[PDB]
Design an enzyme around this catalytic site. Structure first.
Site, PDB file in Angstrom:
ATOM      1  N   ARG A 155      -4.952 -13.839  17.948  1.00  0.00           N
ATOM      2  CA  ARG A 155      -5.013 -15.134  18.659  1.00  0.00           C
ATOM      3  C   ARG A 155      -3.851 -16.090  18.368  1.00  0.00           C
ATOM      4  NH1 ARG A 155      -8.098 -15.296  14.357  1.00  0.00           N
ATOM      5  NH2 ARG A 155      -9.886 -14.089  15.118  1.00  0.00           N
ATOM      6  N   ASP A 332     -17.908  -8.818   8.231  1.00  0.00           N
ATOM      7  CA  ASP A 332     -16.582  -9.299   7.740  1.00  0.00           C
ATOM      8  C   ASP A 332     -16.816 -10.532   6.828  1.00  0.00           C
ATOM      9  OD1 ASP A 332     -14.023 -10.147   7.486  1.00  0.00           O
ATOM     10  OD2 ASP A 332     -13.709 -10.569   9.675  1.00  0.00           O
ATOM     11  N   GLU A 369      -9.089 -15.546   2.787  1.00  0.00           N
ATOM     12  CA  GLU A 369      -8.422 -14.583   3.676  1.00  0.00           C
ATOM     13  C   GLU A 369      -8.487 -15.083   5.121  1.00  0.00           C
ATOM     14  OE1 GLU A 369      -9.720 -12.679   6.300  1.00  0.00           O
ATOM     15  OE2 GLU A 369      -8.042 -11.237   6.566  1.00  0.00           O
ATOM     16  N   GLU A 381       2.211 -14.142  -5.176  1.00  0.00           N
ATOM     17  CA  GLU A 381       3.388 -14.998  -5.523  1.00  0.00           C
ATOM     18  C   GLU A 381       3.446 -15.338  -7.014  1.00  0.00           C
ATOM     19  OE1 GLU A 381       4.743 -17.214  -1.440  1.00  0.00           O
ATOM     20  OE2 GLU A 381       3.156 -18.212  -2.589  1.00  0.00           O
ATOM     21  N   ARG A 479      -5.704   1.436   3.876  1.00  0.00           N
ATOM     22  CA  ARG A 479      -7.006   0.844   4.238  1.00  0.00           C
ATOM     23  C   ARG A 479      -7.772   1.903   5.041  1.00  0.00           C
ATOM     24  NH1 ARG A 479      -5.910  -3.827   8.793  1.00  0.00           N
ATOM     25  NH2 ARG A 479      -8.050  -4.327   8.054  1.00  0.00           N
ATOM     26  N   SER A 570      25.856   3.072  18.681  1.00  0.00           N
ATOM     27  CA  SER A 570      25.572   4.418  18.191  1.00  0.00           C
ATOM     28  C   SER A 570      24.429   4.420  17.182  1.00  0.00           C
ATOM     29  CB  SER A 570      26.790   5.004  17.517  1.00  0.00           C
ATOM     30  OG  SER A 570      26.462   6.298  17.072  1.00  0.00           O
ATOM     31  N   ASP A 606       8.018   7.140 -11.763  1.00  0.00           N
ATOM     32  CA  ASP A 606       8.714   5.892 -11.394  1.00  0.00           C
ATOM     33  C   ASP A 606       9.496   6.083 -10.085  1.00  0.00           C
ATOM     34  OD1 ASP A 606       7.732   4.579 -13.617  1.00  0.00           O
ATOM     35  OD2 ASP A 606       9.716   4.394 -14.609  1.00  0.00           O
ATOM     36  N   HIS A 629      10.061  -5.454   4.457  1.00  0.00           N
ATOM     37  CA  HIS A 629      10.073  -3.980   4.577  1.00  0.00           C
ATOM     38  C   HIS A 629      10.878  -3.650   5.847  1.00  0.00           C
ATOM     39  CE1 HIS A 629       8.580   0.169   4.556  1.00  0.00           C
ATOM     40  NE2 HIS A 629       7.843  -0.099   3.484  1.00  0.00           N
TER      41      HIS A 629
END
Ligand SMILES: *[C@@H]1O[C@H](CO)[C@@H](O[C@@H]2O[C@H](CO)[C@@H](O[C@@H]3O[C@H](CO)[C@@H](O)[C@H](O[C@H]4O[C@H](CO)[C@@H](O)[C@H](O)[C@@H]4O)[C@@H]3O)[C@H](O)[C@H]2NC(C)=O)[C@H](O)[C@H]1NC(C)=O
Ligand SMILES: *[C@@H]1O[C@H](CO)[C@@H](O[C@@H]2O[C@H](CO)[C@@H](O[C@@H]3O[C@H](CO)[C@@H](O)[C@H](O[C@H]4O[C@H](CO)[C@@H](O)[C@H](O)[C@@H]4O)[C@@H]3O)[C@H](O)[C@H]2NC(C)=O)[C@H](O)[C@H]1NC(C)=O
Ligand SMILES: O=C(N[C@@H](CCCCNC(=O)c1ccc(I)cc1)C(=O)O)N[C@@H](Cc1ccncc1)C(=O)O
Ligand SMILES: O=C(N[C@@H](CCCCNC(=O)c1ccc(I)cc1)C(=O)O)N[C@@H](Cc1ccncc1)C(=O)O
Ligand SMILES: *[C@@H]1O[C@H](CO)[C@@H](O[C@@H]2O[C@H](CO)[C@@H](O)[C@H](O)[C@H]2NC(C)=O)[C@H](O)[C@H]1NC(C)=O
Ligand SMILES: *[C@@H]1O[C@H](CO)[C@@H](O[C@@H]2O[C@H](CO)[C@@H](O)[C@H](O)[C@H]2NC(C)=O)[C@H](O)[C@H]1NC(C)=O
Ligand SMILES: *[C@@H]1O[C@H](CO)[C@@H](O[C@@H]2O[C@H](CO)[C@@H](O)[C@H](O)[C@H]2NC(C)=O)[C@H](O)[C@H]1NC(C)=O
Ligand SMILES: *[C@@H]1O[C@H](CO)[C@@H](O[C@@H]2O[C@H](CO)[C@@H](O)[C@H](O)[C@H]2NC(C)=O)[C@H](O)[C@H]1NC(C)=O
Ligand SMILES: *[C@@H]1O[C@H](CO)[C@@H](O[C@@H]2O[C@H](CO)[C@@H](O)[C@H](O)[C@H]2NC(C)=O)[C@H](O)[C@H]1NC(C)=O
Ligand SMILES: *[C@@H]1O[C@H](CO)[C@@H](O[C@@H]2O[C@H](CO)[C@@H](O)[C@H](O)[C@H]2NC(C)=O)[C@H](O)[C@H]1NC(C)=O
Ligand SMILES: *[C@@H]1O[C@H](CO)[C@@H](O)[C@H](O)[C@H]1NC(C)=O
Ligand SMILES: *[C@@H]1O[C@H](CO)[C@@H](O)[C@H](O)[C@H]1NC(C)=O
Ligand SMILES: *[C@@H]1O[C@H](CO)[C@@H](O)[C@H](O)[C@H]1NC(C)=O
Ligand SMILES: *[C@@H]1O[C@H](CO)[C@@H](O)[C@H](O)[C@H]1NC(C)=O
Ligand SMILES: *[C@@H]1O[C@H](CO)[C@@H](O)[C@H](O)[C@H]1NC(C)=O
Ligand SMILES: *[C@@H]1O[C@H](CO)[C@@H](O)[C@H](O)[C@H]1NC(C)=O
Ligand SMILES: [Ca+2]
Ligand SMILES: [Ca+2]
Ligand SMILES: [Cl-]
Ligand SMILES: [Cl-]
Ligand SMILES: [Zn+2]
Ligand SMILES: [Zn+2]
Ligand SMILES: [Zn+2]
Ligand SMILES: [Zn+2]
Lengths: 690, 690
Positions: A155, A332, A369, A381, A479, A570, A606, A629
């Site tokens: 929304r 939910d 959330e 953070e 998930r 390219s 690692d 990302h």
């Protein structure tokens, strides 16, 4: 013995049922006393269950609430100023619920205002719907009130789209086409949305920032806050949601242009005219919004439980899901939170017998959330350096069920093999598949579009608490839930007062068997991630999808061959990087299969852990600094959907409309270079280290 | 045995001497064929010496060169347009040097132009010198040519200062006050700068970006480049350097205002009048610059040598220094490069006998340092993910000597204890200290300003190749050289043609004993960093300096008590964070001293390695995205100097002059919050992990 089977066998449907009931008797709205008490309860129980430490992490973040003494509503107003129709002030409460603190339907973070104008109907208010209105139909939304049906996209994207089109307000409504399945009764007699039901939900476009006032830093006691004028992601026009009884009253008088085609028509007995304004006799009537909600800095509380690892306590596997709900949260989030609770109980049972996982497991009950991932994001953070350097994986745990048909999974390619292997060892709960694996039932019901004999697994986008971990920090995430047979619109009673314990117990999962299967999938993933000697990630799976995504973005670009010739565009570097990644990943897999040496092991673990981390660009994506990302970001047109090679995708989107093609194609080339570089750099993290 | 003493004893002064001679016979300007041949030679020799792998890493970066057929010069021009005096086209070459490819003096990256105007003399062109001119003396530099003496601050800061003052050109010159020590002869009879000598040097303000065309990404074969109009850090006015014979001719006719005080007077026999313009009789003459240099994308080559670790090959200790020089590079950089060469030879000798270091050692011969750290920075951009996750420490190795008096060291607090302990085990090379430790001589000659019986160690700033590793990536870094008794101005022959092998052999270090001592310090640090079981970092040393820096920034703020009252500006959070860091660091030290378990060890070694990393803010400092360290950044007024708590320091600087004090003090508070948060987050990385 203490192995995954012992963990899995300890999980019980009856406990999940008891927890769901316990979690859904009263509302748990973020920032309210009720939700703080539930946090304290969870903290106490997680301690009892046997976790090593369980703490509350609190933050003071911007929330939004209606004004209790000045309610939100919409009117049709005549030429005299008389409000001749008003939308509802609340949803009719369900049977047996004199509950007092039910928040009425509202759009969280809407500004205040009383705009009055003519309506334009914009279908789902998607980018392509506005293209159709403005480019094809020549309808101008400037100074109009837009009415849009919920569904298909987040929304907040609708609201942003309306705002940029010049709308002075947005009315969101639930059409029975999208929220009323044919042949099922409405609540309380079935799982469909009644005409008085309304979907709550925030309308921010935070792009990963977390609390609007403190982007980049936790909203702790001494935090410096942006002034509201500089807050991240707030809409500039008022917004309000309504049910289809009220929508029908608003739409039935609509005139102007016919809907352009049948994909614009819902199921109500109205023409779905686009407008602007009403038909001849009612041409002088208008629609007036009255929005008086306030934004308020409010304390929120995450519960953070730790189960310390026996061997690698500085490696963290995180199982997190939220606890705040719009009202009762029957699905939910409490169907997810009840599953997390039983998972904690099971791990704690093994702990009390002397077992510990190899790696540390962190369990999280996130707050706020529903207001934009505020609890998870502020905590990430605050702890970003620990998570950066120590975070193995994050498994989300919101709603366990949104249907009862089959499994639904979104995760990084690094977890595909883990999910396949786990689901082959779990029992299918489905009718007709007794004695068969969950992998078998899931693959039959949700086949992969590309591979025979494999199930569908989708790309992570946003819309839930994994966002900061995956798209900002580059921690492998996944998930999984049970789903239906409109995969971004939500189930009919999504974010309504009618999402109750009875909804789940009567209509979704009476035996709690789908909940139990979801607990086994989420818990089993966490078990393997926290316990396997070698991390259960297969880098070769990333190599396969990277080729797919490169082919896909090349094919988008190739719709413009003349421009690719003119500007020498390219994709050779990107295909080269993908080829290299494939070769290096194959060699790494060989070495991983071929090494008593715990340094080589950890060195290799690692390399596996930092592989997702390598796709992070510290400069972020264009104008979205918290989406870092390079392979995946939430779609710029629909926050719920993931997009691959998002920087190139957005550079190419609607490029034929840009008035400086040299500049636009330059930016495409820049994004190809960033993507090729990042893929090769990620590959090189898998090379021999020296 | 194979221990540090064996490594140290293998180092020989005579080899360093032979290498220095070999490296300084011809110029090795970045981007030239001569410097590529030297790269190939070094690569071959490092292989011979016994390194496991030695590769060239090349990049195509923006360099700057004079035009061979259109030379740069400055004139005094009369009213008729006759150029009645011209500055030199080249420095007189030293005895025995018909060498052909000596680049004439120029300011690298100056734009082209032929500006003609009146001169204003601006002392060292520091921020405070321009404050004095503009605020106190009421002299307007707009449309003037500024003449400034070299010294005190990085020349790029001078140029930026002049540009912002409205200058249309800058003439830089070497005053004998700063570049001619009393009682020493000029080259070739002593180490002083002759009147025809000139200091080359770049005038960019890159703020850590690396190649101006590719900020954030390596300048590889497929890199997308900014257009020159969007390049990072280029000046907008022409700039040229001259010697003091020529400067005297430009300054002697200066009129207008007297110098404001004696700190504005150098040692030439001129009034040092500030101007603008010349005295009465010459009032109609002007100064005209002729600058025709070009910026050119040019290939550069780093040599990267690897000595693989026996136990932790995925942990990297890096010894790096540059190879490109302005001309012969007798001191800068070949006195450093010769030391690196002998260090490689020594480690290779041990390797050939069957020894390997615990951790991997990387050795680097960087290119294009003189043009703005381009080689080191592009390589670190290419390898940032490997360096992020695996980089233990970086030790720089530019000039080994800039004098023969005592040691000079700048490093992170994490290495203070290592440096103290190492220098107590090394012999002093100093006259009068035979049989004493280097620690003893250094402490006597350069006492700590705060502690009795300790030597001075300074803060890292910029001006050399550690910048990307330390300020961008947060890898613990250090540097050390022999120095004089104007610590930012350079030695007299800095960046002149006269910096030759003979300069060093005759006047600085005839026995190469200071070079050998520097090799023992740099090599010994690398040995311990690469070989010690527990990383040789003491976190308690960071706690001590953080309190010092907090006291210092509080004291700056407290010059404005009324504003601190009005805007409620509190440093309480920052002092709290520092207190917490101190407590947590003390507890961590206790645990580190108190644990056969290689996981706890490595877990603890990872906590030590990531501690410097924790001071990085992924959002960077304001308008300087590549300076990400919150504790240290290069000074905004002098790139060579480090500043502590730079975000708060810059927010407070000249704050009494800001025309919106509410906004300015708001930003001070924001920077206090970021600093307090970062210090507490760094502290928490040292807490028990679970
Ligand atoms: C995938 O991995 C492969 C390694 O298997 C890696 O190959 C590298 O490709 C680069 C880019 O093409 C090569 O770069 C060349 O390096 C040589 C020296 O080794 C130079 O002489 C070349 O420059 C000349 O040719 C250019 C092109 O015509 C001219 O533009 C230039 O001005 C010069 O005339 C060129 O820089 C590099 O050698 C290989 N490395 C190998 C084979 O080891 C490839 O880059 C990887 N893909 C990605 C996207 O990183
Ligand atoms: C240094 O480390 C110490 C830990 O030893 C750490 O102490 C923490 O300080 C914070 C910030 O002051 C404390 O926060 C309080 O938490 C309690 C609940 O535990 C709250 O009830 C408090 O809020 C009330 O009081 C406020 C101040 O008057 C009001 O503004 C607010 O609206 C509430 O009425 C408050 O949030 C925290 O409990 C401690 N943690 C401890 C002691 O474990 C300190 O923060 C560290 N320093 C830094 C810079 O991080
Ligand atoms: O309700 C939310 N999430 C719900 C959205 C349900 C409708 C869209 N569904 C999906 O995106 C989806 C995708 C994969 C899977 I396995 C399960 C669900 C959820 O993930 O279950 N989040 C809040 C808050 C929010 C958080 C972040 N960004 C936007 C909104 C909202 O969408 O209003
Ligand atoms: O010459 C350079 N560096 C020289 C600068 C010498 C004068 C100032 N000295 C210092 O800053 C200094 C500080 C500590 C120590 I131990 C040794 C020297 C060097 O570090 O030896 N770098 C080049 C290129 C440069 C690189 C990055 N930023 C600006 C310029 C230049 O300054 O022109
Ligand atoms: C949800 O379950 C919890 C835990 O069983 C209940 O809270 C407990 O209630 C009893 C009786 O009031 C108290 O003696 C305990 O102190 C509570 N324990 C806690 C908070 O850890 C709670 O009553 C249940 N809620 C509902 C709505 O059924
Ligand atoms: C819709 O709601 C409005 C607001 O309560 C109603 O209008 C008010 O009516 C009262 C008394 O009848 C007046 O004193 C107020 O001044 C009116 N307010 C406004 C803002 O117009 C309205 O009657 C309702 N309409 C319907 C059809 O129920
Ligand atoms: C999923 O299961 C497969 C089949 O067991 C695992 O693949 C095997 O792994 C072992 C151990 O390395 C190898 O010896 C076999 O050759 C593999 N069989 C194959 C590739 O067909 C796979 O590793 C599991 N995935 C995980 C644990 O993530
Ligand atoms: C610097 O030292 C190197 C290495 O000793 C010299 O280069 C060698 O020169 C000899 C004679 O020309 C050749 O046979 C070798 O092939 C060279 N080796 C290399 C490049 O590794 C070089 O001559 C010396 N330079 C100066 C100016 O003295
Ligand atoms: C400074 O240099 C300039 C440029 O070479 C000299 O001026 C030139 O003189 C020649 C012949 O004498 C003329 O043909 C050119 O047209 C002149 N060029 C310019 C740009 O003026 C000048 O003579 C030199 N001045 C001194 C004092 O040596
Ligand atoms: C520098 O040397 C000092 C003195 O040897 C080292 O401090 C000692 O370290 C050992 C090993 O942990 C302890 O048992 C002693 O108590 C320490 N003595 C002290 C603190 O006075 C110190 O660790 C060395 N610094 C390094 C290696 O970075
Ligand atoms: C809510 O509305 C009431 C009643 O008109 C008003 O008095 C109060 O200011 C409002 N509360 C807010 C804005 O938080
Ligand atoms: C839409 O309407 C307003 C005038 O009311 C005008 O300013 C705006 O530019 C119009 N846009 C288009 C695309 O016609
Ligand atoms: C549960 O499954 C049954 C059988 O197919 C179906 O009729 C019912 O509608 C399902 N419930 C939900 C909520 O989808
Ligand atoms: C250098 O100057 C010469 C001689 O006037 C000119 O022909 C050439 O274009 C210049 N070279 C450049 C700008 O690279
Ligand atoms: C300096 O000179 C120019 C006019 O030549 C003027 O525009 C500029 O504003 C002046 N600045 C000051 C501070 O007087
Ligand atoms: C070397 O030291 C001697 C003795 O103090 C001194 O006279 C000489 O000037 C020094 N050389 C340099 C370059 O400082
Ligand atoms: Ca925040
Ligand atoms: Ca670059
Ligand atoms: Cl979920
Ligand atoms: Cl150095
Ligand atoms: Zn949810
Ligand atoms: Zn929700
Ligand atoms: Zn140098
Ligand atoms: Zn230099």
């Amino acid at each position: 013995k203490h192995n995954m089977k012992a963990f899995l066998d300890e999980l019980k449907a009856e406990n999940i049922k008891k927890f769901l009931y316990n979690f859904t008797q009263i509302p748990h709205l973020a920032g309210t006393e009720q939700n703080f008490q539930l946090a304290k309860q969870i903290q106490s129980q997680w301690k009892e269950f046997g976790l090593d430490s369980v703490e509350l992490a609190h933050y003071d973040v911007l929330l939004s609430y209606p004004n209790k003494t000045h309610p939100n509503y919409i009117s049709i107003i005549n030429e005299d100023g008389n409000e001749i129709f008003n939308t509802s002030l609340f949803e009719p409460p369900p049977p047996g619920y004199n509950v007092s603190d039910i928040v009425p339907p509202f759009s969280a973070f809407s500004p205040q205002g009383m705009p009055e104008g003519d309506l334009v109907y914009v279908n789902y208010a998607r980018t392509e719907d506005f293209f159709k209105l403005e480019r094809d139909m020549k309808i101008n939304c400037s100074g109009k009130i837009v009415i849009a049906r919920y569904g298909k996209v987040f929304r907040g994207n609708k609201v942003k789209n309306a705002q940029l089109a010049g709308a002075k307000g947005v009315i969101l409504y639930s059409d029975p086409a999208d929220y009323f399945a044919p042949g099922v009764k409405s609540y309380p007699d079935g799982w469909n949305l009644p005409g008085g039901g309304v979907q709550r939900g925030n309308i921010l476009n935070l792009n990963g920032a977390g609390d609007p006032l403190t982007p980049g830093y936790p909203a702790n006691e001494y935090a410096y806050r942006r002034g509201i004028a500089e807050a991240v992601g707030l809409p500039s026009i008022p917004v309000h949601p309504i049910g289809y009884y009220d929508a029908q009253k608003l739409l039935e008088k609509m005139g102007g242009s016919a809907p352009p085609d049948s994909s614009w028509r819902g199921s109500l007995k109205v023409p779905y005219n686009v407008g602007p304004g009403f038909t001849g006799n009612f041409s002088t009537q208008k629609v007036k919004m009255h929005i008086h909600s306030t934004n308020e800095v409010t304390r929120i509380y995450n519960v953070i439980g730790t189960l310390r690892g026996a061997v690698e306590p500085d490696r963290y596997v995180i199982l997190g899901g939220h606890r705040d709900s719009w009202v009762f949260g029957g699905i939910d989030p409490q169907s997810g939170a009840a599953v997390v609770h039983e998972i904690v109980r099971s791990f704690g049972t093994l702990k009390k017998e002397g077992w510990r996982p190899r790696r540390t497991i962190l369990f999280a009950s996130w707050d706020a959330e529903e207001f934009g991932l505020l609890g998870s994001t502020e905590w990430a953070e605050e702890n970003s350096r620990l998570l950066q350097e120590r975070g193995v994986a994050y498994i989300n745990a919101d709603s366990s069920i949104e249907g009862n048909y089959t499994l639904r999974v979104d995760c990084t390619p690094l977890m595909y093999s883990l999910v396949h292997n786990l689901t082959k060892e779990l029992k299918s709960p489905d009718e007709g598949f007794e004695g068969k694996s969950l992998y078998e039932s899931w693959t039959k019901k949700s086949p992969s579009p590309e591979f025979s004999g494999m199930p569908r697994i989708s790309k992570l986008g946003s819309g839930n608490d994994f966002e900061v971990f995956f798209q900002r920090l580059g921690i492998a995430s996944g998930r999984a839930r049970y789903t239906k047979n409109n995969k971004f619109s939500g189930y009919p009673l999504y974010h309504s007062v009618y999402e109750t314990y009875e909804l789940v117990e009567k209509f979704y999962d009476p035996m709690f068997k789908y909940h139990l299967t979801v607990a086994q999938v989420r818990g089993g993933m966490v078990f393997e991630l926290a316990n396997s000697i070698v991390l259960p990630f297969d880098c070769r799976d990333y190599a396969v999808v990277l080729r797919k995504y490169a082919d896909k973005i090349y094919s988008i670009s190739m719709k413009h061959p003349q421009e690719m010739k003119t500007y020498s565009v390219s994709f050779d570097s990107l295909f080269s990087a993908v080829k290299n990644f494939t070769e290096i990943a194959s060699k790494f897999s060989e070495r991983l299969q071929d090494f008593s040496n715990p340094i080589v092991l950890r060195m290799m673990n690692d390399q596996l852990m930092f592989l997702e981390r390598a796709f992070i660009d510290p400069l972020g994506l264009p104008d979205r600094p918290f989406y870092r990302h390079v392979i995946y970001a939430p779609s710029s047109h629909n926050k719920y959907a993931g997009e691959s090679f998002p920087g190139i995708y957005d550079a190419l989107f609607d490029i034929e409309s840009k008035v400086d093609p040299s500049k636009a194609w330059g930016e495409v080339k820049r994004q190809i270079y960033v993507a090729a570089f990042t893929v090769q750099a990620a590959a090189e993290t898998l090379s021999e280290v020296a």
